[PDB]
Amino acid sequence: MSSRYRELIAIFGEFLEENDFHVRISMDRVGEVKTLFSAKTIPVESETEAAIEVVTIEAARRRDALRRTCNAVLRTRHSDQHVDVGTIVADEEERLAWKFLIGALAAKNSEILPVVEAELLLAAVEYHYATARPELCDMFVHLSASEMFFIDGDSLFMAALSPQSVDWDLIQPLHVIYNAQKLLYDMHCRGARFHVVFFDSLLWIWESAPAKLFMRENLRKTLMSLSENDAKVGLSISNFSSYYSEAFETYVKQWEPEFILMSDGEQLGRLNPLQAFFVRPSAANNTHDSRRKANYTDADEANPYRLRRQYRSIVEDEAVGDKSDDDAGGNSANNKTAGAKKVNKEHAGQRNKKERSKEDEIRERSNVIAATATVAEWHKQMNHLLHAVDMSHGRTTNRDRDESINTIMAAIKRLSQEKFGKNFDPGYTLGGSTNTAVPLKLEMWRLLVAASQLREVEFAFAMEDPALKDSKGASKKKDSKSEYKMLYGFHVINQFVEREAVKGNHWGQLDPLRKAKPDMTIVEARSYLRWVYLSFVEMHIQLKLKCRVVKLQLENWRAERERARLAQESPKIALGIPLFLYCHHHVLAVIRDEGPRMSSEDIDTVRSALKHFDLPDSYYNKLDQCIARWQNMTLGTLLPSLLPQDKQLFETPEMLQLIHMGHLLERPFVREHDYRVAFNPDNWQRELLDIVDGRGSAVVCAPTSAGKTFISYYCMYKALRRTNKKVVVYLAPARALINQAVADVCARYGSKKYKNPGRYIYGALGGADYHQFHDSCQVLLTVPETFETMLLSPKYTDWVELIDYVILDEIHSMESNGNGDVWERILALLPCPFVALSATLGETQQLCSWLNRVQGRLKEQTEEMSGKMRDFEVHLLPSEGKSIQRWNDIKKYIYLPPPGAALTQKKIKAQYNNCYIRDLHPLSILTADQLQRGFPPDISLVPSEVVSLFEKMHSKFNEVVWPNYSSLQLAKTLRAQLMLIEPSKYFEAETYITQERARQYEAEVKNAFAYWAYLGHEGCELPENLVEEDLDDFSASMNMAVESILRTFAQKLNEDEALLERHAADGMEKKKRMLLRQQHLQLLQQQEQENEPNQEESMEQKSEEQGGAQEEEQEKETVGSVSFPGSRQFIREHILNVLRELIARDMGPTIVFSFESEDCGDLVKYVVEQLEEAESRYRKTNEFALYKARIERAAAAQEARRKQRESTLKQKRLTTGDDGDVEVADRDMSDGEGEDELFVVPDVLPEFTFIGEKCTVEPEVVDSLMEDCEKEGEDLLLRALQRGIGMHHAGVKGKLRAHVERLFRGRHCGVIFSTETLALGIHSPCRSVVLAGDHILLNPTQFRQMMGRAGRRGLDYLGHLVFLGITMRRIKRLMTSSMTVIKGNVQMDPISNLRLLQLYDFNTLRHLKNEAGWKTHVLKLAERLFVNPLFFQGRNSVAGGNMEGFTVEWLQMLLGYFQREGLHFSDHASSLGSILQDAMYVFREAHVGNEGFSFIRMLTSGVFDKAHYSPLYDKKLNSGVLD
Ligand SMILES: Nc1ncnc2c1ncn2[C@@H]1O[C@H](COP(=O)(O)OP(=O)(O)O)[C@@H](O)[C@H]1O
Ligand SMILES: [Mg+2]
């Protein structure tokens, strides 16, 4: 204590004038010191914001750095002999150390500068390397790689020469370079990179030990790759130099966006040569792009590094370099607890979320086989019956056909009051109230059609397809009128007439042939014929009301074009489109249908509008013509164009067809499909269903919005409807937890009754419901591990055989970010037909082979009986294709504020963009990318992507004329394609609108674009020239050709992708660097103000030295001090404003994605803050004073009327006698009870456009959910929720979080803040998707779940993904990447094989008989396991291929290692144990061959005959650690 603080002063004063300690008593010029440190290195003060936090943020982790810079300065400022002495400050020696400094700084003012500045710039680069703790990632695989990756070789060489950590193996006499080859052959072989290696050198700095052992490898790999190929040689390398140094490597580094792999440091130090000149690149990188650094650790695959932490800018200098618990709880405490709670389980799940509809379920009980008999027990002639049976129970005819006709009454009565309507007068618009009406009315009579305008007569069969037609046209042709039907409706009498006629055969022999004759004029002959009259009443009734829409759309669309024609241009066709698409929707009905005239109705109305709408003739004759076949069964021909019947043009900048294509998003989607069992839905089902109806395997790819999961509950429909005794199973995306709520909710579209326990669903292990209820039920819901144990697991075997049928979710999403071993196990083993669920998988074939294989192996094992029928595995893509990414397009447009703005913003105010969302147009459309990648995901959309791109492509690959497309047939090889892409884009579904088949154009024109790129920017490498067949390939003009189309790429391309994330992204960083530098113009100048020249013994200024310098901007504020792009909590300031403007472009619900957990809470908090603020800014007597006035005044008056009536009623008194004249009290009591008139002060306007506009759910329950939360209040969810801020994150109770989710789906709330889970095993409606940060992890894996999100189910036309969007480039590295592709793991695992061992040897324990059954089950099991054998990455390991057996060399080593081991249990004295010798009594007889050569079942037979037994105790207790 004392002694050490007597010491340190005596070291100091020797250097320079004695005492610091009292020369001066303070100083106090601290102020000099503190400037000098921080303006380089960080650590001086414990920097305080509002407050320092827990004071181990900057006690512990500060005082390292603080007393580092302290010591390492003073030791260097002790020079004049020694830098050989250490200076270490204690506590009270901090102040001392500073007094020692300040009185040395102003002592000389020359020597001081280098010994500080240099020491600083050294130590800074030391700390920058040390900035750190590290990460553990993981493996290599995730970011290793698409794309441009480098490793600079110097590093490469030292990676081979790296090891102790095992002294180097294999005796070789300095041929070592095999190392390089090995690593190359690892990560190209089963990875991508696109790899580049620099050799960035002479770095070296060798000898530190005799070398080199350099240029050997340099010249080697040079020669290898520049052979040109050899299939072992390629990577590829460049030259350069100049050492490290940038101003060389810049031009490269920019152009091909990458990330980096490099080796600072072990050891071998020496000091300055290594650490210095490697570290400083790292800094450089981070203050360019920013890129990031890895490695030199122990890769292949996973390593270190460092990231996404904020940098010190600038700081540089090159100047080195240099030349029982399931049981007993059911007994003790079960006196009354209370009396069971379980009643609080079932109830919860049975009130749980409502969303979707139904198909048939009722209680069933029976086991069904088919056979019927007389059971009377004869009749045995027909003359023993004569006449047999008659009408009775015929009341099912009587009433039902009365009711039928009573429809046509009501229908045409409702028609009456409508048809005349508000009869039209030219010109008034929009007026016209009944514009609204007919659209509603239409929907009504569509809802109604099922069972009270069509059948009470069965349908029946739905026949074969033409039957509906040919039995219709007949009926009309007997009746005098062309279109029979509605006017004078009811005509079921002349039906009966006709039906009796045509005697021999009743209806003539055509139709009863195809029906396989049922009833002659009895049941079926009536039931059918009825229903085909009758659909065609309903049909024509509606069809007329569709006419009446497109009819009066004429009028509303008149002045819409014409008034605005004068304006500048001639519109509306960007708003005039619904005319056309309505006229489409109308005539869309005809698909089987008899025309409803053309002399009144449909066609006449359509025609008048259509030639008025601009369309010159030619389009005319395509209309009637094609549809003529459809019409006919009815109609004649066509009017001439002559004789008033056309109208004014806009046309030609358009032409006909084009008018559609430019303006609109969204097309039909025609049903017709399956009508007994159905949804309808939209083809995918019409394939999928037929598999499960077999029984089988398969999987469905489906890129999301995807529809995937819900279609699996045909399994549950089968096992429930019919002989319920078999389990259906749904296996989760796993634990935690997300599966559970959805799984539960689905299955409770229809519970079902039983006898004594019985019971419907058991779950678990979880994170809800939680461990047990295990067993009894029909259908299950667990996770991989739970199910596994339940299988092997020897007492649960009973269950296994009763499982038909097992489906398990997600697929791709789990495969990547898991845990993608456990999967393989459960598709190798034991009964099922399976459905399985995946979004996109880029490798086809590879998947399907593995599957189909292991199906055939199951079939094999079940022999000789085989299966009942199926195996086989099917594999649904089957290809245009795409599923519900065809359904709607998703625009991506991204966040970037205009540099320099205000913030807060808020409400009841003018607004525009401003908003940071802008446009985008997908990042990169390029020359270089297209060569390799041509043309990658994610892109699709039309129109306005590839539409006007055509106009470019078609004007400049054809107008070349003709400079080197003339060698060889190149020019025509292109022009044979180009021209033809235009008709194929339209005339798939000509006449009205293309199907949805404007999609197909994208794939068409992908043959245009990518093909050119496979000529390209590169020479003869692609297409690869010399091969005889003609495109090129035998042109030496290939080079020329390549560079003719090189020109023809760039010119058109870069206009469209218009560089938003470059332009103002650099603007923001420009602002950042005018912001940061203004901080150094504060402190520098301020140091002179702190002392002031109101002081000091030098010439007076009287404080004319004050303020900043020297090129001057008004002092430091922008969008904030801390603007600070790509940084955290940047973000929040603008997120409020993003939101508010998305409500005031989009209108839908809004999800916000983030990383869970502290972060998500910080976000929520800040927004609640802002709103509470703005409420304080309304209530303080601005507009508010006026508002409250009214509401207060009128309330008074209300409650005074209460007292008014209370007076006049309280009279006093009827008097008509005496002399008072007439009066009777109380005669007026007609008024009245009134409520509530208002009072508000919780919240008004600033929160009321923040939360959703339109909503649902009666207020009672909403309030009561809030009420619950309030009691146990966690986050103060009670505050956040009611202010519109949804949440869903960890650290929230199950009851509370559950309340949130209902109210987002209920469309009560407007926003929600949560993590990535809500796109996975939970679901919500979305429209504007918001993403906060690109940190700390993304793969295109967990991107593409949220990518296709929005475009809601039958609702929204557009998804919107707004990115934040921290980095500059990484948009590209999400989008432009091709595909998340399978690449699994296994069985080879020790633990698996130990489990299998002990399973077999448990039945070996006392009690054999069943030995037979057991062992042959073990044979089957042994085959079933190791099914291929050998799965995915295991053939890239040590086997090759597909090999196995292979258990032998492991087995034997483990065999004499199981039980030798001392007392075992534990270290306590014998007995327990004394057995330690059992593993020598099985070794010799298992090493006969080593057991002992090829073929599966000789392995396990060899292992029938171990023992392989522990002392009992140990190996059991291994197996029971795991479970
Ligand atoms: N064939 C269909 N036609 C129209 N809407 C459908 C159809 N099938 C499903 N939907 C709807 O779309 C919604 C989203 O589909 P969904 O199956 O939940 O998602 P996922 O792709 O995650 O499996 C469902 O909630 C349902 O409303
Ligand atoms: Mg799903």
Side-chain angles (χ1 to χ4, degrees), residues 681-682 685 704-710 1349 1353-1354:
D682 190 66
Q685 261 112 6
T704 53
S705 299
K708 303 114 60 174
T709 308
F710 93 150
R1349 197 62 51 172
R1353 60 275 167 211

XYZ file of all heavy atoms in Angstrom, residues 681-682 685 704-710 1349 1353-1354, ligand 1:
126
model
N -59.905 -27.147 -54.699
C -59.204 -25.880 -54.815
C -58.417 -25.807 -56.115
O -58.521 -26.688 -56.968
C -58.289 -25.924 -53.605
C -57.844 -27.388 -53.557
C -58.978 -28.171 -54.239
N -57.588 -24.746 -56.234
C -56.621 -24.540 -57.280
C -55.349 -25.367 -56.986
O -55.290 -26.056 -55.932
C -56.246 -23.028 -57.287
C -55.406 -22.618 -58.497
O -55.940 -22.682 -59.636
O -54.224 -22.235 -58.296
N -54.080 -30.141 -55.572
C -54.836 -31.041 -54.740
C -55.280 -32.205 -55.548
O -55.140 -33.338 -55.114
C -56.035 -30.373 -54.035
C -55.754 -29.986 -52.561
C -55.700 -28.471 -52.290
O -55.977 -27.629 -53.148
N -55.296 -28.122 -51.028
N -43.283 -18.541 -49.677
C -44.401 -19.489 -49.446
C -45.698 -18.876 -49.926
O -45.847 -18.633 -51.123
C -44.417 -20.013 -47.999
O -44.405 -18.975 -47.019
C -43.220 -20.961 -47.777
N -46.620 -18.534 -48.985
C -48.065 -18.493 -49.136
C -48.660 -19.850 -49.396
O -49.790 -19.953 -49.867
C -48.599 -17.512 -50.216
O -48.240 -16.178 -49.907
N -47.978 -20.937 -48.976
C -47.861 -22.089 -49.840
C -48.944 -23.094 -49.569
O -48.989 -24.145 -50.207
C -46.509 -22.791 -49.632
N -49.811 -22.831 -48.567
C -50.840 -23.812 -48.779
C -50.445 -25.082 -48.030
O -50.217 -26.123 -48.700
N -49.225 -25.423 -47.335
C -48.560 -26.732 -47.505
C -49.228 -27.805 -46.693
O -49.128 -28.986 -47.021
C -47.071 -26.685 -47.084
C -46.185 -25.642 -47.793
C -45.613 -24.503 -46.925
C -44.719 -24.968 -45.762
N -44.096 -23.816 -45.063
N -49.372 -27.074 -45.297
C -49.535 -27.965 -44.182
C -50.923 -28.533 -44.005
O -51.072 -29.753 -44.015
C -49.107 -27.257 -42.901
O -47.809 -26.696 -43.061
C -49.061 -28.260 -41.730
N -51.930 -27.682 -43.678
C -53.349 -27.990 -43.685
C -53.896 -29.071 -44.589
O -54.721 -29.867 -44.143
C -54.286 -26.736 -43.670
C -54.786 -26.178 -44.981
C -56.026 -25.520 -45.060
C -53.944 -26.151 -46.103
C -56.438 -24.901 -46.246
C -54.338 -25.506 -47.281
C -55.593 -24.896 -47.360
N -44.437 -14.262 -48.229
C -45.423 -13.797 -47.284
C -46.068 -12.544 -47.796
O -45.410 -11.742 -48.456
C -44.794 -13.528 -45.901
C -45.775 -13.416 -44.723
C -46.596 -14.680 -44.430
N -45.661 -15.846 -44.315
C -46.073 -17.084 -43.904
N -47.334 -17.285 -43.425
N -45.205 -18.133 -43.978
N -54.784 -14.922 -48.258
C -55.538 -16.017 -48.792
C -56.865 -15.654 -49.387
O -57.864 -15.579 -48.675
C -54.739 -17.083 -49.593
C -53.641 -17.787 -48.763
C -52.298 -17.039 -48.697
N -51.446 -17.660 -47.627
C -50.530 -16.955 -46.892
N -50.288 -15.633 -47.129
N -49.834 -17.593 -45.903
N -56.927 -15.512 -50.730
C -58.096 -15.026 -51.426
C -58.295 -13.536 -51.372
O -59.285 -13.045 -51.911
N -57.083 -23.726 -52.739
C -57.230 -22.621 -52.006
N -57.908 -21.570 -52.525
C -57.973 -20.434 -51.821
N -57.439 -20.157 -50.626
C -56.800 -21.230 -50.122
C -56.665 -22.466 -50.725
N -56.002 -23.354 -49.888
C -55.747 -22.641 -48.821
N -56.185 -21.345 -48.896
C -56.023 -20.315 -47.875
O -54.796 -19.613 -47.790
C -54.358 -19.521 -46.408
C -52.856 -19.657 -46.339
O -52.459 -21.010 -46.686
P -51.587 -21.939 -45.647
O -51.886 -23.381 -45.912
O -51.907 -21.600 -44.247
O -50.052 -21.831 -45.517
P -48.642 -22.574 -45.684
O -48.170 -22.270 -47.054
O -47.729 -22.072 -44.482
O -48.984 -24.038 -45.578
C -55.155 -20.600 -45.679
O -55.315 -19.937 -44.442
C -56.493 -20.551 -46.428
O -57.207 -19.407 -45.979
